[PDB]
Design a protein around this nucleic acid. Sequence first.
DNA 1: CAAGGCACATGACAACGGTGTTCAGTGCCGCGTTGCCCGATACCCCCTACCCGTAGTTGACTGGCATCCGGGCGCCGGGTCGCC
Length: 131
Amino acid sequence: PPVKGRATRQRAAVSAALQEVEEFRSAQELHDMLKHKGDAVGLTTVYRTLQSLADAGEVDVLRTAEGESVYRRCSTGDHHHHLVCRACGKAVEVEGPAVEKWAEAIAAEHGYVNVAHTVEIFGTCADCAGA
DNA sequence: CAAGGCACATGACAACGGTGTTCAGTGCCGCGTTGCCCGATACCCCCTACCCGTAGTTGACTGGCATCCGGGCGCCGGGTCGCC
Ligand SMILES: [Zn+2]
Ligand SMILES: [Zn+2]
Ligand SMILES: [Zn+2]
């Protein structure tokens, strides 16, 4: 996980933690679990590094209904969209050219030069209903 | 003269006002800690220059050295050969 800044142990640690975790996580709870591992990193430095990763793009970032920015890495680097369970957090990556073609058709119809598409579908998970 | 009808105001009724808290997150901006990058520095190599130890050198050449006295002074102590 190369970073723009000079490599070191702490960014390697947070990158490894993101690698192991395959769920949407917020910065403060990420720091909580990171401290639980025992690295004892600083909150603002964690903020700096995760902002850098979000800028780099290898970690997808979503915004919750409360307004929180939640980050997680995707195995595949191609652009896609994530289906997430609010109760459990199971993030599954799917992509379809139909939505993209729809976006380009709308942009051309309205004469838009460039566009940015953001699509997240929220829904109720299958296993949580069962007890 | 008493009973029945209309005005204004009134006991509650929430919802705005405005401002104060609270979450909580994410930075903002001053204190300290970190990967680089090089640069010099100790430490392997090769070469030869020079220090230092060993071993020969065949006419003959076969016993030295200069001592030491003007203490001085007395005693101890033992040795040492005469003594009868
Ligand atoms: Zn993604
Ligand atoms: Zn898309
Ligand atoms: Zn679920």
